[PDB]
Design a protein around this nucleic acid. Structure first.
Ligand SMILES: [Mg+2]
Ligand SMILES: [Mg+2]
Ligand SMILES: [Mg+2]
Ligand SMILES: [Mg+2]
Ligand SMILES: [Mg+2]
Ligand SMILES: [Mg+2]
Ligand SMILES: [Mg+2]
Ligand SMILES: [Mg+2]
Ligand SMILES: [Mg+2]
Ligand SMILES: [Mg+2]
Ligand SMILES: [Mg+2]
Ligand SMILES: [Mg+2]
Ligand SMILES: [Mg+2]
Ligand SMILES: [Mg+2]
Ligand SMILES: [Mg+2]
Ligand SMILES: [Mg+2]
Ligand SMILES: [Mg+2]
Ligand SMILES: [Mg+2]
Ligand SMILES: [Mg+2]
Ligand SMILES: [Mg+2]
Ligand SMILES: [Mg+2]
Ligand SMILES: [Mg+2]
Ligand SMILES: [Mg+2]
Ligand SMILES: [Mg+2]
Ligand SMILES: [Mg+2]
Ligand SMILES: [Mg+2]
Ligand SMILES: [Mg+2]
Ligand SMILES: [Mg+2]
Ligand SMILES: [Mg+2]
Ligand SMILES: [Mg+2]
Ligand SMILES: [Mg+2]
Ligand SMILES: [Mg+2]
Ligand SMILES: [Mg+2]
Ligand SMILES: [Mg+2]
Ligand SMILES: [Mg+2]
Ligand SMILES: [Mg+2]
Ligand SMILES: [Mg+2]
Ligand SMILES: [Mg+2]
Ligand SMILES: [Mg+2]
Ligand SMILES: [Mg+2]
Ligand SMILES: [Mg+2]
Ligand SMILES: [Mg+2]
Ligand SMILES: [Mg+2]
Ligand SMILES: [Mg+2]
Ligand SMILES: [Mg+2]
Ligand SMILES: [Mg+2]
Ligand SMILES: [Mg+2]
Ligand SMILES: [Mg+2]
Ligand SMILES: [Mg+2]
Ligand SMILES: [Mg+2]
Ligand SMILES: [Mg+2]
Ligand SMILES: [Mg+2]
Ligand SMILES: [Mg+2]
Ligand SMILES: [Mg+2]
Ligand SMILES: [Mg+2]
Ligand SMILES: [Mg+2]
Ligand SMILES: [Mg+2]
Ligand SMILES: [Mg+2]
Ligand SMILES: [Mg+2]
Ligand SMILES: [Mg+2]
Ligand SMILES: [Mg+2]
Ligand SMILES: [Mg+2]
Ligand SMILES: [Mg+2]
Ligand SMILES: [Mg+2]
Ligand SMILES: [Mg+2]
Ligand SMILES: [Mg+2]
Ligand SMILES: [Mg+2]
Lengths: 137, 159, 204
RNA sequence: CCGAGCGCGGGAACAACCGAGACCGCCAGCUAAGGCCCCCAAGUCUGGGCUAAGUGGUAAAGGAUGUGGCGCCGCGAAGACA
RNA sequence: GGGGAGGUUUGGCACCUCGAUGUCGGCUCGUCGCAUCCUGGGGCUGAAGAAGGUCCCAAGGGUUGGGCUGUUCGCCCAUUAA
RNA sequence: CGGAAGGGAUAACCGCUGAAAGCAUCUAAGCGGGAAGCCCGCCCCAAGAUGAGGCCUCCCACGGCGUCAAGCCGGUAAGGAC
């Protein structure tokens, strides 16, 4: 009868940002939000490490994405469709652009949404130096 | 390429002289090289892309030098009857039919002269600024294609 | 950026030279500055003016603790005027020279549950040729199977009035410091006796 | 082939397209189509090219000094092309 | 002569609805498209100027009141930036 | 009394410098100008922004059972309701 872990313990982690290709990096981050690397993987409990990104205001991206890529956003009202381009995201709220990716790479349910909360993105760094912080790459 | 004071950088190139200093940023994937009497330029490959960048930089830096050397300056004629000009201190002010007399800001590091109501010299070190600002003035009232009025460079009349 | 709280006392008209002018009288009584918003403590800049004398009765609340740290007679009301930091003391009508223009804010009269015709000033049906049970009705509200629903924010009957209404560019017709009075161009939201804040316009 | 296989896998979803004919049980294994960056199992595999349009992510006559590649004719240090 | 786009017209087909999906016009309330009527910005003009012509960019707002007919449509009267 | 002003980025379009391509080119590196449109600015809503924010001020210990777990039962404080 297959193994089932007990109350784990939140391993935290610290990722850079500069020079990282937006999507490429976003993948790794997600796989960390879920277990998938921890061999006691359990798809119904959430125990993926806490992730903390910093200097997100520096993310690389190929092509002409800075002008090409535009983020849509619907409000309930007529014509409520907004078209914000990448250039403007970073120009304004830049931690935002990293979120719109990883979130879009997490599962859909109630647990998936919990996982998003385990992500902390900054443009800095200078993040709140709580405790653990094992920088990675 | 004599008169230099050139200095290399992780991407840009400084060029001092009797006139001033001008940082002339150039492609990073390019070798500048500084002989002693002249500055050379080297491209890493003969690919289609590198060709274009070689010749560009080959000139950017050349003009950076000839800039602090002899310097650049453009001429500007003013045809048409009432059309005339004068120099209000640092700034130029010209009238060309417009009910409003056109005051003109002298940009950072540029100075122009009016050795005559018709003649207008735009003197400056930064070739870019000279070319742009020169046109800016012409734009204030391009030449009529039905007469012989307005600002001109020094080329044939539009007839 | 100026600012000052007052009440709509009422309105009449006075004569400027050989021309009559409708004016609304605003009592912008002396406002004891109470606190200050700063970039360091609050994250923005502003000033919390008090207004109107409170009896220490209703002040049973620890509001006294707020008034103590400023040594101010307890007031009946207090709101901030954004981005306006007067010298430490008290603001008054003195900041309004005649000929200045002001943006006045007030809570409009409350028109209760209002029909579409009064609220949105619709057209409604005919008093006459048939129908006779939709005279004040709004008629159609949609289409058919597509979109097959009604638009967000569709105009429909409902409560309307008694909301934050700001008029703009009203001319300061006069100013009577002997009475903390303030004359304007007449049209100012809210009913008489209603609190109302007066600011500097955004014409220039 | 569906009908009668709207049972299973792939195709985003979808009778008839691709794989394959479900007697029952198994917290065992090899595969098929399709896939192996994240939602989602499995290569951010290896080697050699091409593409800078988000092409790929779904359209024609026709138009253009886009870019890379093979072939042919001609001019050239007896001095050309601009 | 040749190639297309669109899905407002007229058709073709007979796929859901005949144990019911109420058909024109008007009124009311609109919202969306842009292949733009006006206003804003441009290129050319066989553009002197004023005024036009043609193509390009651009929905943000605007886009009148009457006569005739059930009319949609259209004609007409008086205006209009339209 | 309002439509704005103004700031910023752009469309067609107009340019500076400028190779690839000894000239030429607004462009491939790079830059300036340019719309009633875009983003701000104005007015209104708005922390169920479950990502529930911020500031000033006020009241603070258990009074009995639960040893461990968080709670649980009555009397009160600032304060609130009837
Ligand atoms: Mg595109
Ligand atoms: Mg569930
Ligand atoms: Mg479910
Ligand atoms: Mg009526
Ligand atoms: Mg009837
Ligand atoms: Mg009836
Ligand atoms: Mg629907
Ligand atoms: Mg529906
Ligand atoms: Mg009264
Ligand atoms: Mg049958
Ligand atoms: Mg069969
Ligand atoms: Mg089915
Ligand atoms: Mg199937
Ligand atoms: Mg899917
Ligand atoms: Mg199917
Ligand atoms: Mg199926
Ligand atoms: Mg099947
Ligand atoms: Mg096959
Ligand atoms: Mg797959
Ligand atoms: Mg095609
Ligand atoms: Mg085809
Ligand atoms: Mg094609
Ligand atoms: Mg073709
Ligand atoms: Mg052609
Ligand atoms: Mg020959
Ligand atoms: Mg020989
Ligand atoms: Mg040639
Ligand atoms: Mg055809
Ligand atoms: Mg149709
Ligand atoms: Mg048809
Ligand atoms: Mg049928
Ligand atoms: Mg048949
Ligand atoms: Mg039925
Ligand atoms: Mg029915
Ligand atoms: Mg009908
Ligand atoms: Mg009808
Ligand atoms: Mg026009
Ligand atoms: Mg004209
Ligand atoms: Mg003419
Ligand atoms: Mg003529
Ligand atoms: Mg003529
Ligand atoms: Mg005129
Ligand atoms: Mg074009
Ligand atoms: Mg168009
Ligand atoms: Mg009419
Ligand atoms: Mg007429
Ligand atoms: Mg007219
Ligand atoms: Mg006309
Ligand atoms: Mg503006
Ligand atoms: Mg501004
Ligand atoms: Mg443009
Ligand atoms: Mg040129
Ligand atoms: Mg460029
Ligand atoms: Mg460019
Ligand atoms: Mg600009
Ligand atoms: Mg503007
Ligand atoms: Mg306007
Ligand atoms: Mg802004
Ligand atoms: Mg913004
Ligand atoms: Mg409210
Ligand atoms: Mg509010
Ligand atoms: Mg709250
Ligand atoms: Mg609030
Ligand atoms: Mg709160
Ligand atoms: Mg606080
Ligand atoms: Mg105690
Ligand atoms: Mg005690």
């Amino acid at each position: 009868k297959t193994y089932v872990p007990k109350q784990v313990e939140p391993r935290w982690v610290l990722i850079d940002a500069e020079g990282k290709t937006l999507g490429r990096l976003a993948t790794k981050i997600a796989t960390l939000l879920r277990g998938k690397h921890r061999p006691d993987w359990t798809p119904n409990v959430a125990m993926g490490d806490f992730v903390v990104v910093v200097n997100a205001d520096k993310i690389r991206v190929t092509g002409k994405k800075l002008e090409q890529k535009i983020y849509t956003r619907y409000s309930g009202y007529p014509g409520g469709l907004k078209k914000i381009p990448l250039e403007k995201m970073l120009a304004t709220h830049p931690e935002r652009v990293l979120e719109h990716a990883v979130k879009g790479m997490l599962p859909k349910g109630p647990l998936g949404r919990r996982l998003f909360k385990r992500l902390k993105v900054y443009a800095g760094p200078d993040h709140p130096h709580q405790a653990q912080r094992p920088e990675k790459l | 390429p004599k008169g230099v004071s050139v200095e290399v950088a992780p991407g840009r190139v400084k060029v001092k002289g009797p006139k001033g200093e001008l940082e002339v940023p150039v492609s990073p994937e390019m070798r500048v090289v500084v002989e002693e009497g002249v500055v050379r330029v080297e491209r890493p490959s003969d690919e289609r892309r590198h060709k274009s960048l070689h010749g560009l930089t080959r000139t950017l830096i050349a003009n950076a030098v000839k800039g602090v050397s002899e310097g650049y300056s453009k001429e500007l004629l003013i045809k048409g009857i009432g059309y005339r000009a004068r120099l209000v201190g640092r700034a130029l002010e010209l009238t060309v039919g417009f009910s409003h007399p056109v005051v003109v800001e002298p940009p950072e590091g540029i100075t122009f002269e009016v050795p005559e109501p018709t003649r207008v010299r735009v003197s400056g070190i930064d070739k870019q600024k000279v070319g742009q600002v020169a046109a800016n003035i012409r734009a204030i009232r391009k030449p009529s294609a039905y007469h012989e009025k307005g600002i001109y460079y020094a080329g044939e009349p539009v007839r | 950026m100026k600012g000052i709280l007052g009440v709509k006392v009422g309105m009449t008209r006075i004569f400027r030279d050989d021309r009559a002018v409708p004016v609304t009288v605003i009592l912008a009584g002396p406002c004891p500055v109470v606190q200050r918003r700063t970039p360091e403590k609050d994250g923005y800049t502003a000033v919390q003016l008090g207004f109107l004398p409170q009896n220490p009765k209703r002040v049973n609340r620890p509001l006294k603790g707020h008034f103590a740290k400023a040594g101010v007679e307890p007031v009946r009301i207090l709101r901030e005027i954004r981005d306006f930091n007067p010298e430490g003391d008290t603001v008054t009508v003195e900041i309004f020279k005649p000929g200045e223009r002001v943006d006045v804010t007030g809570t409009s009269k409350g028109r209760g549950f209002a029909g579409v015709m009064k609220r949105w000033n619709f057209a409604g049906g005919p008093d006459s040729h048939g129908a006779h049970k939709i005279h004040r009705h709004p008629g159609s509200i949609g289409n058919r199977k597509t979109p097959g629903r009604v638009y967000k924010g569709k105009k429909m009957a409902g409560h309307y009035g008694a909301e934050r209404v700001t008029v703009m560019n009203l001319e300061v017709v006069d100013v009577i410091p002997e009475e903390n009075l303030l004359l304007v161009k007449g049209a100012v939201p809210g009913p008489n006796g209603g609190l109302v804040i007066v600011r500097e316009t955004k014409k220039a």
